Amino acid sequence: KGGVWTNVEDQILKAAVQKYGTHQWSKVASLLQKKTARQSELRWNEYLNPKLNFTEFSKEEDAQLLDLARELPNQWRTIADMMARPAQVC
Amino acid sequence: TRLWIKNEQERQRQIQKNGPEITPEEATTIFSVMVEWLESRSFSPIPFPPLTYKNDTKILVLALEDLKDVYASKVRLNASEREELALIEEAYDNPHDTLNRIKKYLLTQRV
Amino acid sequence: MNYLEGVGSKKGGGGIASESQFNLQRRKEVESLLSKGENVPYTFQDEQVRSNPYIYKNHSGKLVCKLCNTMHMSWSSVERHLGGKKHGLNVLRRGISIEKSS
Amino acid sequence: KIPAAVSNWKNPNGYTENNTINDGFMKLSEALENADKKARQ
Amino acid sequence: TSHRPQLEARSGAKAAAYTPTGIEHARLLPGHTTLKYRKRSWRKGTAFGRGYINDMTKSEYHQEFLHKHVR
Amino acid sequence: RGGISYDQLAKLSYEKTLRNLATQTQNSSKQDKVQKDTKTGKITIADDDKLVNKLAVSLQSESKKRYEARKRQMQNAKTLYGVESFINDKNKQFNEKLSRES
RNA sequence: AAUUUUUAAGGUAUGUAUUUUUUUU
RNA sequence: ACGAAUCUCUUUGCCUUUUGGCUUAGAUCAAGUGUAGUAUCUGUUCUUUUCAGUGUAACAACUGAA
Ligand SMILES: [Mg+2]
Ligand SMILES: [Mg+2]
Ligand SMILES: [Zn+2]
């Protein structure tokens, strides 16, 4: 249940996604052993997409966050879409 | 199917823009209805499954058999199927381990 | 009337190929991606400007830095080296070593 | 001057959200948060 | 890349004949040969008691469709 | 600032060649008809073999120069930009067009 | 209170060369 | 100084296949394991005070106090 991604299999995605684009995931797993398409896509969206925001937290965010999490009880995709951040970070 | 999914997305965007249709008044009255009923019936809220619970293994057996009956028939298996059947067979080989895995997910995992 | 199905086959030879054959194909393409398509030349080939110019391939298949005299297993390792602090130094040393003569 | 077409769905041969929420959600959750605290007292 | 389709004149300059080779089709057999010329306790108890858009997909007829056949 | 329509450009080149020609004339100074047949209306014009050979040589020479200068822009063009990843020449060339689009 | 009968095609490729009496220096 | 020719250089400008089409993304499919062992990249720490022992081919390294 590991499915853990080494820095080589992270470096091959970003080169595969650059080549094949984001809707050909079946081809990305051809370049990448150990990993299926649903595993490749899920990482590209949750981690490796450079348009993702992994950064420190301003003082307005923790106010914005604790506002949403209170006003929307557990819904962490809907909050994350409001925050423009990946859910498991938010 | 492409049309249907488009109507779903349109509907949900419009519920973001307009907002919920309940109004807080109706929601309050509904909540009152429930609470009064559950008092009238003196209901005991369902607990969280304890560490040692009498039936854990049995509730597994029922669950895992419900999952396995799908692949009892199937002939040529795709990859996802083999993945699942691997998970079920492991669930029989370590019941305790997979119970701990389950309960842990009942706590921590919100995405 | 089995045309109802919709699968078929071409009439040539025997299809799937052998798992070993897939790895050879997959490990060439992965070394094409990470390499960004460059042709890294063999050491004996008697020099198409190289992206860098130091990396080569010995009479065996391995990759080598000709400055640092290091041997590398894969492109991924090389990019570690080219981004390393030793391959930094040997450029500076050759930097000085040229700046003292012409 | 036209751009160059790059498709997400094909790479043949060579050639390598804004708006916020509503006051609807803000108001509804309070009523459920208030009405619950009242009922839990 | 269809680009330039096919010109008729090259097919119209072929030396077959004025007609085709003389194949007799089944739809060129003479038909319509002539022309035509013009000239109270129960009620109380409860808690809650008492434009055409131009588009195919956002239209009103469409939602009715996916309201039924997608069940 | 700016582009130029194919008219003005044509004029400019006309002037350029006028100047070049006038210089050939001056340096040549430093180093130192119409008949139409009665049978057919075909007109004939007397020609100096010189200046015609000079013309052909001018055209060929200018073509050589243009071809060469463009060729040098070929050479520098590929050797200058090594920043982003590229699989082949054509890729790099296209992405330099993307640099022109900015 | 009475039906109704069968032949082709989409599957085993396709392409090239091959039996020749020695065109005048 | 100037009319002015030719080679060299920068810039502006000009620019190359700047992906052959179409449909239900046209459809679907993918990684063996265990025991022993070596090779090879990168990151982090040290060229820095004396003497006494251990240690080494000699270093190094390790061990004490001013
Ligand atoms: Mg077929
Ligand atoms: Mg057909
Ligand atoms: Zn090096």
Q: What is the DSSP string of A36-51?
A: -HHHHHHHIIIII-TT
Q: After which residues is chain F broken (C to N over 2.5 A)?
A: 32
Strands C70-72 and C55-57: unpaired
Protein CA C86 to sugar C1' H53 (Å): 39
C30 contacts: CB under 8 Å, gap ≥ 6: A12, A31, A32
In angstroms, rounded to a whole number, what is the distance separating the alpha carbons of residues E16 and E13? 9
In angstroms, rounded to a whole number, what is the distance separating the alpha carbons of residues A31 and D40? 57
Q: Count, in order, helices (H) and strands (E) of chain F.
A: 3, 2
Which residues in chain B are contacts of A77 at CB distance < 8 A?
Answer: 111
Q: Please give the full DSSP string across A21-85, using - where no structure is assigned.
A: -SS-HHHHTTS-TT--HHHHHHHIIIII-TTS------HHHHHHHHHHHHHS-S-HHHHHHHHTS
Q: How far is CA F46 from CA B10, C100, F33, in A?
A: 82, 70, 5
In angstroms, rounded to a whole number, what is the distance separating the alpha carbons of residues D15 and C46? 31
In angstroms, rounded to a whole number, what is the distance separating the alpha carbons of residues B90 and B84? 10
A28 contacts: CB under 8 Å, gap ≥ 6: A13, A16, A17, A20, A37, A40, A41
Residue F56 per-residue DSSP state = H
Residue E58 per-residue DSSP state = S
Give Rg (Cα) of chain A: 16
Contact of A6 with chain C, judged by CB distance below 8 Å, is answered with: no
C55 contacts: CB under 8 Å, gap ≥ 6: C40, C63, C64, C65, C66, C78, C82
> Could you tell me the two tokens for C53?
């110019």
Report the greatest alpha carbon distance in chain D. 70
> Could you tell me the two tokens for C27?
């490990």
What was the resolution (in A) of this experimentally determined structure?
A: 3.5
C40 neighbors C55 (Cβ within 8 angstroms): yes
Centre of ligand 3 from the C-alpha of residue C89, in Å: 9
In angstroms, rounded to a whole number, what is the distance separating the alpha carbons of residues B43 and D40? 15
In angstroms, rounded to a whole number, what is the distance separating the alpha carbons of residues F47 and F54? 13
Q: How far is CA B21 from CA A65, B26, D22, D24, in A?
A: 24, 10, 12, 8
The bound ligand whose nearest atom lies closest to the alpha carbon of C6 is 1
Nearest to C63 by CA among B77, C71, A5: C71
- Which positions of chain G lie under 7 Å from any protein Cβ? 10-13
Cα angle vertex F74, ends F72, F80, to 5°? 95
The count of C-alpha atoms lying within 13 angstroms of the C-alpha of C46, restricted to the half-sphere facing its C-beta, is 0
Distance of CA C30 to the CA centre of its chain: 9
Q: Which structural technique was applied?
A: cryo-EM
Nearest to A15 by CA among A31, A34, A35, A1: A31
Protein CA C59 to sugar C1' H38 (Å): 22
A43 neighbors A5 (Cβ within 8 angstroms): yes
D36 contacts: CB under 8 Å, gap ≥ 6: B31
The helix/strand/coil state of D33 is helix
In angstroms, rounded to a whole number, what is the distance separating the alpha carbons of residues C35 and A12? 11
- Terminal C-alpha separation, chain E: 42
Domain residues for the domain of F22 are: 1-102
Residue given tokens 């002939």 in the structure block = B75
| Residue from the list F87, F91, F101 with its beta carbon closest to the beta carbon of D1 | F101
F79 neighbors F72 (Cβ within 8 angstroms): no
The bound ligand whose nearest atom lies closest to the alpha carbon of C82 is 3
In angstroms, rounded to a whole number, what is the distance separating the alpha carbons of residues C61 and C72? 10
Q: What is the number of domains present in chain F?
A: 1
SS (H, E, C) B69-99: CCCCCCCCCCHHHHHHHHHHHHHHHCHHHHH
Nearest to C51 by CA among C27, C29, C70, C79: C79
C-alpha torsion angle, residues B69, B70, B73, B78 (rounded to 10): -140
In angstroms, rounded to a whole number, what is the distance separating the alpha carbons of residues F5 and C15? 60
- Other Cβ atoms less than 10 A from the Cβ of F8: the count is 10
B13 neighbors A81 (Cβ within 8 angstroms): no
Centre of ligand 1 from the C-alpha of residue C3, in Å: 9
Report the greatest alpha carbon distance in chain F. 73
Centre of ligand 2 from the C-alpha of residue A29, in Å: 33
| Residue from the list B19, B25, B31 with its beta carbon closest to the beta carbon of D24 | B19
D27 neighbors B26 (Cβ within 8 angstroms): no
Strands F35-36 and C70-72: unpaired
What is chain D's length? 41
In angstroms, rounded to a whole number, what is the distance separating the alpha carbons of residues C67 and C94? 9
Residue given tokens 């054959």 in the structure block = C21
In angstroms, rounded to a whole number, what is the distance separating the alpha carbons of residues D3 and F97? 10
Min Cα distance F91 → chain D (Å) is 5
D16 neighbors F91 (Cβ within 8 angstroms): yes
B64 neighbors B92 (Cβ within 8 angstroms): yes
> Could you tell me the two tokens for C2?
């089995």
At B27, the amino acid letter reads A
In angstroms, rounded to a whole number, what is the distance separating the alpha carbons of residues F83 and F74? 18
Q: Please give the full DSSP string across chain B, using - where no structure is assigned.
A: -HHHHHHHHHHHHHHHHH--SS-HHHHHHHHHHHHHHHHHTT--------SS-TTHHHHHHHHHHHHHTTTTT--S--HHHHHHHHHHHHHHH-HHHHHHHHHHHHHH---
| Residue from the list B16, B20, B32 with its beta carbon closest to the beta carbon of D28 | B20
